[PDB]
Design a binder for this molecule. Structure first.
Ligand SMILES: [Cl-]
Ligand SMILES: [Cl-]
Ligand code: NA
Ligand code: NA
Ligand code: NA
Ligand code: NA
Ligand code: NA
Ligand code: NA
Ligand code: NA
Lengths: 371, 370, 374
């Protein structure tokens, strides 16, 4: 136990020194403009330099609705669905995050404490506001019109700007990293009336005649350069750099009215946050199809069994607003769910109404060691 | 000497408790009723671990049975769904005893923004007021029924990380008492021209408004699995021997252009002060006040400010203004504390004073159990 | 050789004394002066603050009534609007040393940057309880119609100390001999109103009725924030000597010579530790939302850019700092945790590579920095 306490102390000190001595850099890695009808999957090759903290991905797109008369309107996720999936592999080909664009975006929001890169509305007479359209998409695209969209995603390796847990040391000249981006295409972006809008950007009677004109992306890599050297070479937080900080998502089915649907935290990961999306057969409701949600331990005791509005209240304290309809969030950052500290734990949803093809899309944020 | 070590130990124990125990939020009671029959309830919380506070959810349906006239929300609106709250701990010592609106304003001051609100942004992703956590229709038309939702946090512990004021109830045995007095058909509706201070809706149809029903659910927040050491449970004795209370009072006797001073009592460490200028039923946006201040006898004013400048300081604390006639003062970093009664006072020099004018004061403070 | 231990010890002593001062003294905010005037008669004032204890800064309240006397045309707020009620502010301490010397718009943008949101603004929420813009702390009508009179209110915080907890830059004002001086150069009928097609940079309103707009009056009230009842010890008053011997200043400048697709570089001077940088691209009177820029960057002598970004990505970083965008053509850069200091690395420069350059284009730079009094 002394070897550990000292190991953690050494790690923190090394982290603190790296942060004080190195200088942060953010620089463009690659940009590409394309038509997803031609290609929608791209493998970006990050530069191998210093300690890598994450990637900021700018995505723009132009969409045209050529329907003769009908419009389409943004889905609840909208531009967050411009990227369908993101997967990162480090120089040792160890996979870190692999999740959907919508889940990654919701975590970006949770970590910011407000809708990611949004512009807050105030009474200021000075002309602050949505000036630069950092994340933007027209509410509707009428028949015959073309809309322009902009979206940003932060793909994290390091947990934060000050906590390097999960960061990647990329100083091995011949071992490349891989950032795979799978973009939306005409098939995923447009949903007909009555179809499931989960993965779509726009939905409406004009959907069949909507097409992307183009999508463009620019990946910026954030890293620390001029790493401090000491009496043993680079001073590095060994625990930070051998821990993976990942996001992943999965789908669970088998819900029945008034019965507890339990999703066990199946791995021995340290779960920092959990997102549960109740895709009630293509319908996304504002809590009205749920009796309660909870986190429960094998001891059968609930640590937070709450009605939907009260559950939402806790989230409002975290992001200053509510996540979209049917999206529920749970913060476990200070005391991560770890099944080896207490019995197995489960995330619980007791549904009031269950439509055909109902399912819970689970999104997790967690730490785990490489070994 | 000493103390340095007493506080050092208290803080160490607090840290161990926060690190080792596990937080739980649990429903302890729910009830639906008709205020025509009853509006005062005494909730019995569970005696388990260290209790931090209670989240009280209140929902109500209001029917405007008037034939042709509507009513509209007052400035406090749903914050008046609970008229008063009183908490007694296992040792029969009272902590908070205040109005629902004062409790709500403190919840907002502590959050740094309107309590449990949804902030509006340009995000195209559909975040927003999706769940209507705190909600009430702006107006209820003649013949219509409106649905309202309100939440209040009754604190024992000062915060999630500062357990000062928390209550140990894992042992006490004796019961705790959380008393709640709800709005009723006599307090919720104000006629045009009547004082709207304690009401939820005001308007020409008020006389014919009534509650269809009210429901409440109390959730208790506490720490379980308390850490044990040599001498036994590791506990922050100072935290648990200190009361963190909210209290209200009313003062009258205001006259144009004369300093109206409300004295702070001794012994209490006042963290915040709220003063509501109920100018005879009229609530104005500072236009009826010359200035407000906090003053020490023989040391003058530490912050004598015009109303807008006073409001500017508040905008730095809650990112907006409190409702008309509601003034806030933050003294958290250096609490008002006098060894002599009234060695410090809160001042309001009114420009205009209507009949039946008064200041409704609200205080947040720390004080020793002994 | 070494002996640098002195610095280490000096820093510790400075921090200890700062803490003692913060713990023992009591904060006071007090009105020092209020005046109502007609800008046609005068617009420059020199305020003499009180010499009491350690001065942290000044909160300046400014109100105005503007009438648009045009027979038919209206005027509308410029992007800066009421932030241009004060054109320039300059502070001198008792030793007659200059601290902040900048434009009202720059001071206001820094007030916003340090708050983490539009300065003293009222956010909008779904709360049914009537919070909101109740007190109109900073306010100005979006337009003033022909024949109408509009009322404005704006506030500026002129900092001496860096913050309420970091007294770096604060001023000890106890010498009865020499007075401090806070100079305010206000807007007047020649700066506040821009005709259609004229440069709106320094104006409050712009539009077809501008030539007939006039101030009815402007009023200001200066409140001084300071620490009184300073703690004493064996060696007398306990005081953070480094904090009180360091200047925390805001200054602005102007540079021209931009050409399409060529890097325009503005060098940071040596000795100053730059906490933030603001660059306003006054493209010949046109202020655009990034569309006239290829990219912006901060660069060191080594061709090494630490953040060469396209305008929207640059704007994204700013949204993380103030929760919204600064007005069109206004770009912000936060270097608070690692201040730009040309001694730490080679010379450093702020870069703008413009896509389009109109005649009379220029970059207006605003800086926040720390520097030794000596
Ligand atoms: Cl009943
Ligand atoms: Cl005059
Ligand atoms: Na192809
Ligand atoms: Na609502
Ligand atoms: Na009645
Ligand atoms: Na009372
Ligand atoms: Na306003
Ligand atoms: Na003029
Ligand atoms: Na200068």
């Amino acid at each position: 136990a002394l070897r550990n306490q000292q190991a953690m102390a050494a790690n923190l000190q090394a982290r603190q020194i790296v942060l004080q001595q190195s200088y942060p850099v953010i620089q463009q890695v690659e940009t590409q403009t394309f038509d997803p009808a031609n290609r929608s999957v791209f493998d970006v090759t990050p530069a191998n330099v210093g300690i890598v903290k994450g990637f900021l991905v700018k995505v723009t797109a132009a969409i045209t609705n050529n329907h003769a008369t009908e419009a389409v309107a943004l889905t609840d996720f909208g531009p967050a669905n411009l990227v369908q999936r993101v997967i990162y592999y480090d120089p040792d080909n160890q996979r870190h995050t692999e999740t959907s664009g919508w889940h990654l975006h919701f975590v970006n929001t949770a970590k910011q404490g407000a809708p990611f890169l949004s512009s807050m509305v105030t009474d200021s007479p000075i002309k602050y506001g949505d000036v630069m359209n950092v994340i933007d998409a027209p509410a509707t695209i009428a028949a015959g019109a073309t809309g322009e969209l902009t979206m940003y995603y932060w793909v994290p390796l390091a947990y934060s700007e000050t906590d390097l847990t999960g960061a990647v040391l990329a100083n091995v000249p011949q071992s490349k990293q891989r950032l795979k981006l799978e973009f939306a295409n005409n098939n995923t972006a447009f949903a007909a009336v009555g179809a499931n809008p989960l993965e779509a950007i726009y939905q409406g009677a004009g959907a069949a005649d909507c097409e992307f004109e183009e999508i463009s992306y620019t990946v910026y890599q954030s890293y620390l350069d001029q790493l401090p050297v000491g009496q043993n070479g680079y001073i590095l937080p060994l625990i930070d750099l051998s821990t993976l900080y990942n996001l992943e998502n999965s789908a669970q089915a088998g819900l029945t009215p008034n019965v507890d649907f339990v999703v066990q935290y199946a791995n021995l990961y340290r779960y920092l946050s959990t997102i549960a999306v109740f895709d009630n057969g293509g319908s996304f409701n504002a809590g009205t199809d749920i009796n309660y949600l909870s986190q429960r331990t094998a001891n059968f005791s609930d640590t937070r069994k709450l009605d939907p509005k009260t559950w939402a209240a806790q989230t409002r304290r975290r992001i200053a607003t509510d996540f979209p309809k049917g999206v529920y969030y749970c913060d476990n950052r200070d005391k991560p769910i770890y099944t080896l500290q207490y019995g197995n734990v489960g995330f619980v949803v007791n549904p009031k109404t269950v439509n055909q093809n109902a399912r819970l899309l689970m999104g997790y944020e967690y730490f785990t060691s490489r070994t």
